[PDB]
Amino acid sequence: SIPWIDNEFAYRALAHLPKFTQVNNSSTFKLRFRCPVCGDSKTDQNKARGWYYGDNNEGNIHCYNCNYHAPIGIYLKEFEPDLYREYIFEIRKEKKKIIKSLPSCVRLDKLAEDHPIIKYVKARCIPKDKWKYLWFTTEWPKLVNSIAPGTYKKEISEPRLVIPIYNANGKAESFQGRALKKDAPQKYITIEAYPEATKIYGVERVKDGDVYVLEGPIDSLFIENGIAITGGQLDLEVVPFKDRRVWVLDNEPRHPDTIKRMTKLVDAGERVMFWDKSPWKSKDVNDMIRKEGATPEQIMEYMKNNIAQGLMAKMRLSKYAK
Amino acid sequence: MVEIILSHLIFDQAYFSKVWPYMDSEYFESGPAKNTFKLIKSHVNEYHSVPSINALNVALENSSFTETEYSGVKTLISKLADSPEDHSWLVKETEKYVQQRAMFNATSKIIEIQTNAELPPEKRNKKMPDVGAIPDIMRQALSISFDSYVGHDWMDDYEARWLSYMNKARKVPFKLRILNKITKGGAETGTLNVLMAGVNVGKSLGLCSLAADYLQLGHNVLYISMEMAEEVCAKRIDANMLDVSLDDIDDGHISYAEYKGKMEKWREKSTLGRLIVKQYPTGGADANTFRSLLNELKLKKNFVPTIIIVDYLGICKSCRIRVYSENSYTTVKAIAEELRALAVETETVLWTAAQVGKQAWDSSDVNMSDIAESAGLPATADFMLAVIETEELAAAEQQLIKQIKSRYGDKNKWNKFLMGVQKGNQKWVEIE
Amino acid sequence: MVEIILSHLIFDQAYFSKVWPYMDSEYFESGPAKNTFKLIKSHVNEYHSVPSINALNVALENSSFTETEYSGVKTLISKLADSPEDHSWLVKETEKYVQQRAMFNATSKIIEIQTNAELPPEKRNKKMPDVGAIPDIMRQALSISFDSYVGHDWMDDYEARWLSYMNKARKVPFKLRILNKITKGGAETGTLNVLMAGVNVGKSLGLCSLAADYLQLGHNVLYISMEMAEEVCAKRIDANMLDVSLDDIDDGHISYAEYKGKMEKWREKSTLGRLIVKQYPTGGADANTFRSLLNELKLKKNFVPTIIIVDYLGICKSCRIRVYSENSYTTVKAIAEELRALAVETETVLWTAAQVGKQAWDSSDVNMSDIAESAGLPATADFMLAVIETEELAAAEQQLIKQIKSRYGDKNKWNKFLMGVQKGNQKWVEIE
Amino acid sequence: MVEIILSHLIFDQAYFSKVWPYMDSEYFESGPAKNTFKLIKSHVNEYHSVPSINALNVALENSSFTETEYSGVKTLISKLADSPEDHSWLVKETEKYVQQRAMFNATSKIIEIQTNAELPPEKRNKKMPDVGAIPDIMRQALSISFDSYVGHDWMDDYEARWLSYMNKARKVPFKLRILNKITKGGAETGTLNVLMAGVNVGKSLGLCSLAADYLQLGHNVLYISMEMAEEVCAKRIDANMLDVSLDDIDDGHISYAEYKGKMEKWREKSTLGRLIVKQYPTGGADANTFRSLLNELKLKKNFVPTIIIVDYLGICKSCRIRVYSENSYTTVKAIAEELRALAVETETVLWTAAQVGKQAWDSSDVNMSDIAESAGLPATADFMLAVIETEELAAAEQQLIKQIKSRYGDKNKWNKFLMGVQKGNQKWVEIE
Amino acid sequence: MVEIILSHLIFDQAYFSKVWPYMDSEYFESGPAKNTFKLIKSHVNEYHSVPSINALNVALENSSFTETEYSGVKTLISKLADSPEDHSWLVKETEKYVQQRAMFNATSKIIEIQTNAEL
Amino acid sequence: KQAWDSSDVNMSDIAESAGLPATADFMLAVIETEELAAAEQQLIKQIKSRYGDKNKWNKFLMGVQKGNQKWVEIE
Amino acid sequence: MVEIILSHLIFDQAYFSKVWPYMDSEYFESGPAKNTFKLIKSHVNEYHSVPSINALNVALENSSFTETEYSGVKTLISKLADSPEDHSWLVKETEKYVQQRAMFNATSKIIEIQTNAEL
DNA sequence: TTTTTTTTTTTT
DNA sequence: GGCTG
Ligand SMILES: Nc1ncnc2c1ncn2[C@@H]1O[C@H](COP(=O)(O)OP(=O)(O)OP(O)(O)=S)[C@@H](O)[C@H]1O
Ligand SMILES: Nc1ncnc2c1ncn2[C@@H]1O[C@H](COP(=O)(O)OP(=O)(O)OP(O)(O)=S)[C@@H](O)[C@H]1O
Ligand SMILES: [Mg+2]
Ligand SMILES: [Mg+2]
Ligand SMILES: [Zn+2]
């Protein structure tokens, strides 16, 4: 198919749609908009469940409200035949910033031992030394607007735990804020100094031997050579130590997305971790530590004797499925 | 002028009586117009009357439409009004609009077809017509008109019937008088003639005999052989015309001197045409390839045929359907339609030879329920004959013709007659 | 829809007299519509007549309603429509509305019954029906139909049935006295009637004679031909109607002047019908293609026939069998059933012809046992007339008509009769 | 691929001699490609030869272009090399490119015609054709195949045809005088020959007899077994060649001395060929496997077989159709077509067996209709003989061979002849 | 060593004669290598000859896969180049590679069958 | 069904497929009539004999004993 | 269901008679389950009778492992109870468990063989 | 929509 | 703030 011309035609046709958004990352062409087929959610007028994907082999539209999915050509012919004919004829026609200041931030290692967040991190059972990499803020929106103005409409006083993300050079080019309260718009609000900032945590702290890729940076704290891809799309290329890295996901065997990711990793022949014999059964490492009492050295012992790759990984995954 | 068309469908009766049977949902844009026409058509199908504005507003409320579609339909219904105009400009304007919409739809369909064809196999859409089907679609769109003839109306179409009585179509005579008797003077120009027969019973023998007979009458004959080499067909023709058996030619009984003398004696005769034999691989030729062959024959040899002969219909390519897409019946019917269209376009008598089913083999009588590949061939054909040399006709050096479908005359007059097939000379002689 | 229902209750008579007995207060709403209908019902009860707008407003003024109810009723009364919608659509739509509202009310009632059932027995309403009454309640919701006509009810439709026997509502005369005598007034609508032809008996002569006779009596005739073209069948029709011999047309004895004069003389007569001749290939017309042809003729030609004449039953194709045979019993039985179903569903007299058994061919007498179609045609045919042509009858220009199956009347009343067949004009004349 | 087309136009005479006849400026582009082709066409018109790079550059200097077009043409001309690609792929690819560009141009032309038609008559251009020219425009763009050969002429090529009559290199003798007599010189290369009979009648016996007869004539024979093992069939070939028995081999009546003496005596003969026996599991081979087997045989040993014997076509597996995708009439015919294509590609005589349905397993005669698998096999076949054995025949050890489909010669000259089949020796013996 | 195998399938008639009968599409990769081999196999089935670089580029342009796949195939084709080699080392190495890929596919299918039957 | 209670059974009497005789090395037909049953014998006919010539010794009478489920020869 | 299997090996008798011959130390685990089964098998080999819980504690005391796993083993033998389950279900579930573990071990073994062949 | 095996049934 | 096939 012809992705670029389809993307252009979809852009022309859907420029006028409600909630139209040009959600285009560095490698994908997605358009977010309110689904004209169903008007998206009747209750929520700000929902834009109409999505066009040009990254797909053929730019395809799908609504998450009316569950209407089709190619761009089908929608164009069934809704705008006028430009559809011109498009179908065209078918054969073609034929960096570094964060330097920490306003309203007090590092946990230098924070007072009586601070409530210190007590919470004790409930989180984080190693004391790791506190020299985490700050606490009472003015997270204020701090972000001080560093990146216009981010927050109001600089409300919100206490969060700020983990700066240091590049291999050790330069904080981003930061993730964890809301202390159980209720929040997002558990981990991550803001980067520049769009090309590193999405991998602990890169500056990588040592010799195998490197363990985890989910949460706090989880990586308990682990030597623990790096954390800070959200985003899992891309092998952006990940260093492509020779020696070790994949460690959450212990959620019945969860479908986790096993999908693990299948993706193993099909790339990677070296992954398996929990099919873990004495603890919590979802993640920190949960095993705080609940099952799991201690980090036992965890490392288990993991160094549970890494599998290739056919070994595949067969050990089959059993771990369910 | 969709709004005017809908308004005068709702508010006018003579306009509705004149234009409704020809309107279709595909003639309207996918916005409010198509949905409003859907409501009107559903109401007419359910109650056999033209709906009012209240009926449609009731039908709109009792419909599964989105908010945008509902708003568009309601706005379009509100905008409808009975503008007084003349019932001679409305009909012609509606006809023009319908023709334009049909042409637009045909253009979109062919543009899509071309896009589908260039796709690699195992990804391209199936059941979608190939590139060779493009002109036929464009022939259908131009035929849209608000005038329709369904059957012959007595007392309403009687001038044409009198013309048919008094006038007779031109006929290309045969050389066998029996065929002229059963066809009232021969075969017409734009026709598809088929000589069905069993396997190895004389399909090519009869076609080569016809080719020789037409060549002796001064016609330009094109023999498209899809199964045999050019030299083999030309040797059959030589045996027919030089009165030498195929055994004599193969064994070398005749010398080059006698062969050259006979060929030059035939050349010196003024009442001789030109026969050109073209061989194509099995499944490698279609109607478009035949048209290219005709174009190159006219341009490079100054040759315009009249008696185009295809050795076997079942081997040729569909030209409208992709290979191995539909069943044998549909593909063979499409081939027959394409060949008849080619014959009509080129004004050439087209002769072919299909194969009967296994049941008809060694059967003393055959009928229309014996065609192997497709029973739709008689419908497309204009004259169809059969060969019944089963068990004892071969010993008597004879044959039999059933006359399965004869559009030139009446099949039940000389339905079965005996033909003296001579296989050494590859010819038909008459028993008279 | 409620606005339309109330408006046409106020401003109509037939609609009121048709839908008032099936109209209840609970069918409308719990707001302005219910109050307006209560006013209408109160007025019709106190004064047995449909109220007017002024009377309705006076009643609303002298009524116990709050401010919001007063405003709603006033607005609804001011929003009445006197538009004259078609009666059939109005009745059907109000029936659907009533049925939907009744179903909704019954479902709500059974849900409330179930909810009350799951309550402390000491604490429940006594008036609420028990759970066992649920299946009956829904039945009362399903027993709502403005008009109940399921079949023919003996002792409840005897007055309408008598009007059928006196008015001969089903009979279609023949224009031949003998055929009317043995059919008690002609053939009936929704019937299949066939002619059995023995030796020297064409099947299309009798069919063309019947078609001409029906045409002279004012009936719309649809002649579907299989083995012949439209022009040939219409030429047989012309021979019978214009009194010109069939061979005279081909020879040219009759000139254009006489032909046109006779045709215009026939056109002047107001007792003449329309004849539509449609041709189909042999075996290419099942009794589902005929339905499409009828739909096209009704939509485009406005031609709704009362007589349908198929040239030959054997040549037709069984839609149910799909596979086709030249002379197979299973196909003939299916073809007859399909054609009779078409006749019943179209309320038309359907005519066809078949060949008698070989033994029937040799014997002047033809027995139902002596029929090519055994237990297949004398089972699906209301009338089966047999035609016998021997040497002595042919020398006297006659054919012996024998009655082999007569659903209409007694078969043995007048079984044998001599018919004056003219093979040149394709006509049947009576014999004194 | 315009660069490739231009490079092989300039730098290849064979390519120029087959594509230049069909090439236009509209086919290439609107930019540098069209200008380069225009320069080439101008140079070839002014001087009847293919230009060189230096001459093309000099002409470009002489010709006048704007700056952009001049730069584009210079850049394109710089990019021309010999690059000796395959001729067949090159001509096929340029034909595809020409066809797709012609289709694009035709679609644009008809779109322009439609756009001009909608314009008012005053504004519209008179040069553009009417809409009625849309179909043929799309048809002339579907008849642009690359084919300059028109075919035989029968009067301008009778000398070449007579010379072709003397080319008997296709014939392969049979070593049996009766088979040569009925085939007019034996079987021909690239033909599908079939030997059909019932179960346990001697089909593989006849195949092994033919293999031995061809081996004794010096041919290379490739026997492909589908049921039996390699050593079992080689035992039958040994029984035919050494001429002792089948049971005596297994009963020890032949000592190793006599066995060796005979094999070495046959080795000393210079008239002996090479025989390779290959076995395949049932339903696991076709021409695709056979072509790879042929390539491996040619690479490993100096063995190019002239005769290819397939144990049974039915046991074989079709290339495109899966194991049970479609019914027997299709996949069997597909396998037959693939085998004939393989034979005509390798120019080898292909022999195979066929099964007969149960209706003729105990009959004194077998017809062509008695083919157990698809009836398309007796359509792709060329010399389908038949083996019939009865009790009287088995008493005399004389199988009857009936000529079922004879494409080489007259099927009815010697229709039935007796053979002298010796079952112990697996040999066919002629009867005099 | 997929690049070497493809390069000597293109630029070596002796190598193609022995390895081709056995080469299959499931022995290379799920990305550029499989697509390039599919192009080569289609060309061989259509013309019974080994395609050249120009033929591969032409077939690549007349292909329907996405931008990533197109770029990968283009890079792989541009990297194909004949090298001074010896028939034996190549045939043995190709046999080892084909056997290893066959074993890998077999064990993957075995794992798939085991994890499918346990449903 | 047509071969049941018949004095002779042919190869064409195979029930479920005509391909079974084609894909079978050896087949033997067991035939029993009332006379044969009274003689405690069965006629075995060689229908498809791939190990030898079927014309020779085509039909011989085995001495089936139904009580002992045993075949015995008559030689 | 290793806990159920061990508990019904120690306590149940007919289940022990039917299932013991088809028991191997490779079917259970590489942790506390394997150690417990090894202790039970050693005891049944020494004394041709099923051991008791006190006997298991004595065997743990005299025959010791590294404390890291030894704690896990001693906390593994604290849950084995009588739990009179039905015989047919217990046998069927034990058979399914041992079959699954045998398939897993065979797949791991063939993967290791393939890995060794590559070396 | 045809094609081929096998069976079962029925009609002539 | 993402999430489809
Ligand atoms: N060389 C020949 N010499 C004499 N008679 C021949 C020769 N070739 C064919 N015939 C006869 O001609 C008859 C008809 O052959 P064809 O013309 O090929 O009929 P056909 O229907 O075309 O056969 P097909 O195409 O294989 S179904 C055969 O049955 C033979 O008897
Ligand atoms: N070992 C043998 N000794 C003697 N005669 C044999 C032997 N094997 C077969 N025959 C004879 O060969 C005749 C037919 O041979 P076949 O080749 O088996 O026939 P065919 O079954 O058509 O070929 P197939 O099925 O591909 S093996 C049988 O009727 C036997 O008389
Ligand atoms: Mg032929
Ligand atoms: Mg056999
Ligand atoms: Zn939606």
PDB file of N, CA and C and ligand atoms in Angstrom, chain D residues 198-200 203 355, chain F residues 21-22 48 50, ligand 4:
ATOM      1  N   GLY D 198      -7.961 -51.612 -15.500  1.00  0.00           N
ATOM      2  CA  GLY D 198      -8.526 -51.829 -14.190  1.00  0.00           C
ATOM      3  C   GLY D 198      -7.456 -52.119 -13.154  1.00  0.00           C
ATOM      4  N   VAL D 199      -7.916 -52.474 -11.961  1.00  0.00           N
ATOM      5  CA  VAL D 199      -7.017 -52.806 -10.863  1.00  0.00           C
ATOM      6  C   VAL D 199      -6.480 -54.217 -11.067  1.00  0.00           C
ATOM      7  N   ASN D 200      -5.155 -54.361 -10.966  1.00  0.00           N
ATOM      8  CA  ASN D 200      -4.471 -55.649 -11.094  1.00  0.00           C
ATOM      9  C   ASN D 200      -4.674 -56.245 -12.488  1.00  0.00           C
ATOM     10  N   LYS D 203      -1.059 -52.489 -15.600  1.00  0.00           N
ATOM     11  CA  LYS D 203      -0.645 -51.130 -15.940  1.00  0.00           C
ATOM     12  C   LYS D 203       0.843 -50.926 -15.681  1.00  0.00           C
ATOM     13  N   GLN D 355      -6.590 -45.167 -13.696  1.00  0.00           N
ATOM     14  CA  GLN D 355      -7.517 -46.156 -13.176  1.00  0.00           C
ATOM     15  C   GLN D 355      -8.865 -46.053 -13.879  1.00  0.00           C
TER      16      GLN D 355
ATOM     17  N   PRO F  21      -8.904 -51.385  -3.336  1.00  0.00           N
ATOM     18  CA  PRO F  21      -8.188 -52.389  -4.138  1.00  0.00           C
ATOM     19  C   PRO F  21      -6.943 -51.843  -4.813  1.00  0.00           C
ATOM     20  N   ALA F  22      -6.936 -50.559  -5.173  1.00  0.00           N
ATOM     21  CA  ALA F  22      -5.779 -49.990  -5.851  1.00  0.00           C
ATOM     22  C   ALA F  22      -4.610 -49.776  -4.896  1.00  0.00           C
ATOM     23  N   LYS F  48      -7.227 -59.504  -5.705  1.00  0.00           N
ATOM     24  CA  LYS F  48      -6.041 -58.714  -6.112  1.00  0.00           C
ATOM     25  C   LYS F  48      -4.824 -59.460  -5.581  1.00  0.00           C
ATOM     26  N   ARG F  50      -1.027 -59.462  -5.667  1.00  0.00           N
ATOM     27  CA  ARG F  50       0.169 -58.757  -6.103  1.00  0.00           C
ATOM     28  C   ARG F  50       1.440 -59.581  -5.956  1.00  0.00           C
TER      29      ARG F  50
HETATM   30 MG    MG J   4      -3.084 -51.812  -9.274  1.00  0.00          MG
END
